[PDB]
Design an enzyme around this catalytic site. Structure first.
Site, short mmCIF file in Angstrom:
data_model
loop_
_atom_site.label_atom_id
_atom_site.label_comp_id
_atom_site.label_asym_id
_atom_site.label_seq_id
_atom_site.Cartn_x
_atom_site.Cartn_y
_atom_site.Cartn_z
CG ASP A 138 -1.76 -1.21 1.34
OD1 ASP A 138 -2.24 -1.73 0.32
OD2 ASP A 138 -1.88 -1.71 2.48
MG LIG Z 1 -1.90 -1.20 7.41
#
Ligand SMILES: [Mg+2]
Ligand SMILES: [Zn+2]
Ligand SMILES: [Zn+2]
Ligand SMILES: [Zn+2]
Lengths: 50, 17, 98, 338, 335, 101, 67, 243, 48, 49
Positions: free
Chosen positions: D19
């Site tokens: 991410d």
């Molecule tokens: Mg996280």
């Protein structure tokens, strides 16, 4: 050849220049508005243009 | 245009400080 | 719910098993020196060092590794009985030790 | 609340795993993701039973007549000048409290910030109960850095993991470079196909000159957006052929490439970084305080204690729990255990 | 293959140079000038004051991308670095305004200024050879007039908009003669810096120095410098009839045309082609066309911010690459 | 006399040269990639590649391994000479096309 | 607030295009796409900088404290 | 961990060690503790050190190993369609190291018409760069997607895909580098076998090489997901409808 | 390894005792002081 | 030699906090299973915890 570098108040209601005396009141003299703002300082402020 | 600006001018910025 | 109940069984079992440690005579004991297991898992083997299926050695990989590491085309293959002779020269001293 | 980042959905530099985002330096330099914090501090010059009140007297100087450093941006009234920078340790409200509420003990309002702020508003007023009210607004311009949090309206948040120079970014035939690189591994498991459709719709929208619609159970149809993309010269699926910025070669995969709306979340690592060596301790427990504002220490809980026990690190247990939290040299009687 | 990047429907192939000895048994493609010198070629397509478009032909990707990277990030230009605010009563914050002024590109040619030495004191860092000083003094007042009530602010007030052209060149020291014939002005003078209502004023001076686009985007001299490989479309078999018109529609307008009489589609101008590979999705032209890009034919487009011409920017980039190679060559190697 | 620009990494260096890593500060992919290309264009060079070990540091580590004909330093020096010559050819051709126009 | 001087991505100067884009939309009314292309905003990043900009400074100036 | 001082305001960790922490770089915060005594410091780095804890104690399976993009980059390198000339190969090896490692370049897999190296040779050099490297690894593994050979009597490495990894003397003789052979939970992992035969230092060296190589390789190769990757083909529309 | 901000490295210290092996290093760290990162924040004398 | 050496290495080292390790080994995988009973669809078994 080188180089060097390069108590006013505003009423929040009518935008008037005011000078607060020593212990008088915190109100505008033109209108009755009770909120005063310090005007921008006179001295130089330097910012890096980034 | 069509000018060799770099030959005409002696550069200074391009050299390392 | 899981984030609320994370580390609940961990804490409970930690209170249960916290003081158990392996001793220098291969016993698992309480802090009160009471025997819980006379040997860990009935084996003495650390689960962190198991390379097989909860067994200490992966025989197939170990055999392939030995063959590759000692390989030499200019080498003589032992007869099928001689392989067992070398195996029983190594094993058998350690088998009779026990 | 956000900006339309030019986004290339590709694995890049290895700082975009789990991410993490790749941010373009010089997009940041040009004002992408720029934000400011504005914080207020309120003081009351209250009144007292012995016909006394607080004051804002101050701005003292040194021998030359030069203001001392702590009063460097104060101004004659004792309230930090509007426009001036205030650094950590400097005073912007010079509040003196009477010692017998004649004499005035100092209670200055100190700026305690890791990074300098600027004074943009000082409001002097009175409250409903007759007594003076002071509010000073401190503004702090923030530039995005590593660990700053961004999100794309589809639940794909992630911190900035690296800021790379524009020339290192991949470029298309026109020299467009992404402002952000969104890792492609965040899509297959999260199954946000709406983010891809948004990329294509926004791309066709900018090319066509129109804002598009992603209304639930509707919105701009994907095939119409593909028609716009093809009519503008782009691939229908939004995948442009890119050149590597560091080698210059064509990337062997076509890169999903276009505008995505990105939000800078309030969670900025500048407000999260905290480090305590020694500081205040609780009066009761003699243990480090519990507040990041009070320079508190990081708790080592029962589960961390369980982990350290499972490692069998006895001396580390002693060091973390007793020696470096609260070690007391007591006197113990050997007759009475008291 | 063989110098052609393959454009497939799902991938890009043959993107690496493969022009070195040790690629094949014939250890050919050793480096030598007088082979590269005779094969390399430049074809200039257009020249403006702000944009150039030229073809570096028969050069490697590493060198072309080195020039591109140098132009974007390492060619020096001049931009405002420090802004001193005497008075700023507008709604735009001081640092926001300072950042905007920094992003204003100045029409001062580098090599008129020397690099600033930052090891010197603050009182001794800026000289008449290091710095351009730009001032800005705007005060907004109501227009002493009476047009339609609530009209556009350009006539309700005076100085209601602050443009980059309002930045004034202030010669310091000997710049009064050095810059007399080339006064420092914004490259884009209509850049909107700030909007202000009556009673608001912006007074400042800005010091402008040489910088590097890697240090900050504002110093980059190119609003974009990049290249692209030359598209190549190979029509393997004749396309005729309406199928030829569909094939034509698969590409931008001028890329391919239909021959009169033969009615076959031929590649008319592959340069105008954007490689959307639209044709590669129809399964009708699947074997009738091959898309590609010439791997060593680079179509450079260099659009300059305005301080210097694009051909000058490119030449400076080549000179910068040569200079860094030469500096390394002269440097001794330390253990 | 710049003594800090290019260093020879001794732990990565072989006996008698022919295999050496050089550390070049204030350098990045720009010079690294062009230098690697030019150096691979040398018959004696069997190995050339650079790496920027970390983005935080302006540092480039270029590795050259040769066959026995030359040493890595010689291949490096030849690579720099050839890069200079190539950029000179580019300069001449570009200035000529500018003049012609 | 006020239009950025530069496209965030390419760095092209778009701050001198906002008033002329507004004028092209209002006077001699055109589509947003054609108005953007008439200003030389060909790259979609540059088109975005103008198409998506919200001119909040004009609203913020209605609250002028120094009237 | 060994502290490495860096300019920005975040704690940074190599992604291989995200799994034990269960950390995912979306605003996750972690706590740093500095032991203050020599005894505690030695205990920490010798019992709790990362290299000493590449396996979980609950099963013995590796827990520190390649994560997502590292796995995908390894897969794309070892994919059977990957071929490299000498220049690209040596640039890959320089990325894999810092440029400070000697590599013995093996003979190319393809010698005519061109000198080309497969990606499995790249990963063999990752495991064992030069002859001085002591890491000689032998391994058989079933990749996470293993389709069997066309014949029930063929050996597993004859899988119709690269479904089976054969490693002999640190040479990868078949099979792609998947999660099952570079990730967690399997004891036929490459890093697990390196650990068990040669120690945590060499296992970590190989893992560091893989991390640096993937971090530089994937960005320059290109790997993207798009709407066309999740668009069903036109035949599947009709098939699924009637089905 | 873990990358640690220099900002928190300047507050998170280790109490290194001076020996005959590290005295020169610790003097250099003392000279650098609390602000230059390879520095030192506190000194505890042997007999204080 | 390899098999015997590995068998020797496998032995549990004295001093090991094997009880705490077992506690975390039985309580870690438990931190990923639902508190409420969820079953595969179609099993239709007895509602067993
Ligand atoms: Mg996280
Ligand atoms: Zn008033
Ligand atoms: Zn007693
Ligand atoms: Zn743009």
């Amino acid at each position: 050849x080188x180089x060097x570098x390069x108590l006013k108040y505003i009423c929040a209601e009518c935008s008037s220049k005011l000078s607060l005396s020593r212990t008088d009141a915190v109100r505008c003299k033109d209108c009755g508005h009770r909120i005063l703002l310090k005007a921008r300082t006179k001295r130089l402020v330097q910012f890096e243009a980034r | 245009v069509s000018r060799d600006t770099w030959n005409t001018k002696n550069m200074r910025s391009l050299e390392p400080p | 719910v899981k984030t609320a109940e994370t580390g609940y069984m961990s804490r409970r079992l930690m209170k249960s098993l916290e003081d158990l440690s392996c001793q220098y005579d291969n016993t698992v004991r309480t802090s009160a020196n009471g025997i819980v297991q006379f040997t860990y898992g009935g084996d003495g083997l650390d689960p962190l060092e198991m390379e097989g299926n909860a067994q200490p050695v992966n025989f197939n990989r170990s055999w392939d590794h030995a063959y590759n590491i000692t390989f030499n085309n200019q080498d003589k293959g032992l007869l099928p009985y001689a392989i067992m002779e070398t195996a029983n020269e190594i094993l058998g001293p350690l088998e009779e030790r026990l | 609340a956000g900006q339309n980042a030019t986004v290339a959905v590709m694995s890049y530099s290895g700082y975009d795993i789990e991410d993490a985002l790749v941010l373009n330096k010089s997009s940041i330099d040009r004002g992408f993701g720029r934000c400011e914090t504005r914080r207020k501090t309120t003081t009351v010059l209250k009144r007292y039973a012995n016909h006394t009140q607080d004051i804002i007297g101050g701005m003292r100087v040194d021998e030359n007549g030069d203001p001392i450093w702590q009063h460097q941006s104060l101004g004659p009234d004792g309230l930090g000048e509007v426009g001036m920078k205030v650094q950590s340790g400097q005073i912007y409200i010079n509040k003196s409290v009477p010692t017998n509420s004649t004499q005035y003990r100092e209670a200055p309002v100190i700026y305690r910030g890791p990074e300098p702020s600027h004074i943009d508003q000082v409001m002097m007023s009175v409250s409903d109960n007759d007594q003076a009210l002071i509010k000073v607004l401190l503004r702090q311009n923030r530039r995005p850095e590593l660990g700053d949090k961004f999100s794309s309206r589809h639940g794909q948040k992630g911190v900035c993991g690296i800021i790379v120079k524009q020339e290192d970014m991949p470029f298309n035939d026109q020299g467009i470079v992404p402002d952000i690189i969104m890792n492609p591994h965040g899509f297959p498991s999260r199954m946000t196909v709406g983010k891809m459709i948004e990329l294509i719709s926004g791309k066709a929208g900018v090319l066509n000159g129109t804002l598009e619609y992603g209304t639930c159970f509707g919105g701009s149809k994907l095939e119409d957006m593909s028609k716009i993309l093809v009519d503008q010269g782009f691939n229908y699926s939004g995948k442009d052929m890119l050149y590597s910025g560091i080698t210059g070669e064509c990337l062997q995969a076509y890169i999903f490439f276009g505008p995505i709306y990105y939000q800078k979340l309030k969670h900025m690592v500048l407000d999260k970084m905290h480090a305590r060596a020694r500081g205040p301790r609780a009066v009761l427990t003699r243990q480090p305080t519990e507040g990041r504002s009070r320079d508190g220490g990081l708790r080592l809980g029962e589960m961390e204690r369980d982990c350290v026990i499972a490692y069998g690190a006895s001396q580390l247990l002693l060091e973390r729990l007793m020696i470096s939290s609260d070690a007391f040299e007591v006197d113990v009687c050997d007759k009475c255990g008291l | 293959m063989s110098n052609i990047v393959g454009i497939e429907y799902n991938r890009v192939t043959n993107t690496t140079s493969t022009d070195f000895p040790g690629f094949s048994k014939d250890a050919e493609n050793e480096w030598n000038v007088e082979k590269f010198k005779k094969d390399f070629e430049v074809n200039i397509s257009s020249l403006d004051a702000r944009e150039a478009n030229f073809d570096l032909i028969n050069i490697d990707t590493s060198i072309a991308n080195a020039f591109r990277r140098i132009m974007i990030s390492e060619v020096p230009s001049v931009a405002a670095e420090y802004v001193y605010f005497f008075n700023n009563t507008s709604v735009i914050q001081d640092e926001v305004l300072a950042h905007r002024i920094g992003l204003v590109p100045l029409k001062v040619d580098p090599d008129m200024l020397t690099w600033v030495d930052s090891n010197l004191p603050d009182d001794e860092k800026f000289t008449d050879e290091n710095t351009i000083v730009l001032s800005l003094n705007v005060k907004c007042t109501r227009n002493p007039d009476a047009p339609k009530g609530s009209t556009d602010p350009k006539e309700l007030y005076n100085n209601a908009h602050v443009y980059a052209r309002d930045l004034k060149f202030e010669p310091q020291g000997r710049q009064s003669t050095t810059f007399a014939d080339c006064p420092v002005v914004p490259a884009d003078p209509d850049i909107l810096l700030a909007k202000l209502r009556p009673g608001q004023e912006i007074s400042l001076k800005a010091h402008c120095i040489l910088g590097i686009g890697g240090d900050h985007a504002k110093f980059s001299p190119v609003s974009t410098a990049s290249y692209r490989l030359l598209p190549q479309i190979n029509i393997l078999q004749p396309i005729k009839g309406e199928s030829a018109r569909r094939f034509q529609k698969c590409f931008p307008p001028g890329v391919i045309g239909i021959d009169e009489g033969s009615d076959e589609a031929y590649v008319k101008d592959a340069r105008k082609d954007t490689v959307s590979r639209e044709v590669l999705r129809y399964e009708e032209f699947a074997d009738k066309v091959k898309l590609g890009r010439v791997r060593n034919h680079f179509i450079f487009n260099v659009e300059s911010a305005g301080a210097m011409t694009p051909e000058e920017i490119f030449f400076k980039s080549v000179r910068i690459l040569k200079n860094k190679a030469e500096y390394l060559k002269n440097c001794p190697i330390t253990q | 006399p710049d003594r800090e620009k290019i260093k020879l990494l001794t732990q990565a260096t072989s006996e008698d040269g022919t295999s050496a890593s050089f550390q070049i500060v204030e350098e990045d992919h720009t010079l690294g990639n062009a230098l690697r290309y030019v150096i691979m264009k040398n018959p004696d060079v069997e190995f050339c590649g650079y790496s920027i070990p970390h983005p935080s540091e302006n540092l480039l580590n270029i590795r050259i391994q040769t066959y026995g004909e030359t040493t890595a330093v010689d291949a490096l020096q030849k690579g720099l000479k050839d890069l200079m010559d190539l950029c000179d050819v580019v300069e001449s051709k570009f200035t000529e096309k500018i003049k012609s126009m | 607030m006020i239009v950025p001087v530069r496209c965030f991505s390419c760095g092209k100067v778009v701050g001198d295009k906002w008033e002329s884009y507004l004028n092209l939309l209002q006077e001699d009314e055109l589509d947003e796409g054609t108005a953007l292309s008439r200003l030389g905003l060909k790259r979609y990043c540059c088109r975005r900088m103008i198409l998506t900009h919200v001119d909040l400074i004009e609203k913020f100036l209605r609250y002028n404290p120094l009237e | 961990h060994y502290a490495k001082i860096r300019p920005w305001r975040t704690f940074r960790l190599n992604e291989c060690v995200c799994t034990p922490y269960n950390a995912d770089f979306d605003g996750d915060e972690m706590n740093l503790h500095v032991p203050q005594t020599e005894e505690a410091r030695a205990e920490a780095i010798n019992l709790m050190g990362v290299k000493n804890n590449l396996l979980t104690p609950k099963s013995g399976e590796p827990i520190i190993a390649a994560t997502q993009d590292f796995i995908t980059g390894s897969y794309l390198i070892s994919h059977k369609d990957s071929f490299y000339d000498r220049a690209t190969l040596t640039q890959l090896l320089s990325m894999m190291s810092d440029g400070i490692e000697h590599f013995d370049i093996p003979p190319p897999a393809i010698m005519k018409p061109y000198y080309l190296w497969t990606g499995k040779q790249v990963f063999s050099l990752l495991i064992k760069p030069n002859h001085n490297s002591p890491v000689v690894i032998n391994l058989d593994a079933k990749n996470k997607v293993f389709v069997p050979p066309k014949s029930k009597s063929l050996p597993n490495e004859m899988s119709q895909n690269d479904g089976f990894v054969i490693i002999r003397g640190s040479q990868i003789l078949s099979g792609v580098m998947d999660k099952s052979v570079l990730g967690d939970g399997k004891k036929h992992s490459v890093f697990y076998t390196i650990l068990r035969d040669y120690g945590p230092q060499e296992a970590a060296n190989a893992m560091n090489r893989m991390a640096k190589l993937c971090a530089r390789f994937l960005g320059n190769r290109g790997f993207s997901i798009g709407i066309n990757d999740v668009t069903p083909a036109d035949d599947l529309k009709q098939k699924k409808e009637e089905l | 390894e873990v990358a640690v901000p220099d900002r928190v490295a300047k507050v998170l210290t280790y109490p290194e005792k001076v020996t005959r092996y590290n005295r020169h290093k610790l003097q250099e760290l003392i000279v650098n002081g609390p602000n230059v990162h390879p520095g030192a924040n506190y000194l505890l004398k042997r007999n204080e | 030699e390899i098999a015997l050496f590995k068998y020797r290495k496998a032995r549990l080292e004295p001093g090991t906090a094997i009880g705490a390790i077992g506690a975390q080994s039985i309580g870690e995988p438990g931190t990923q299973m639902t508190l409420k009973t969820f079953h595969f669809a179609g099993v239709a078994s007895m509602n067993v915890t």
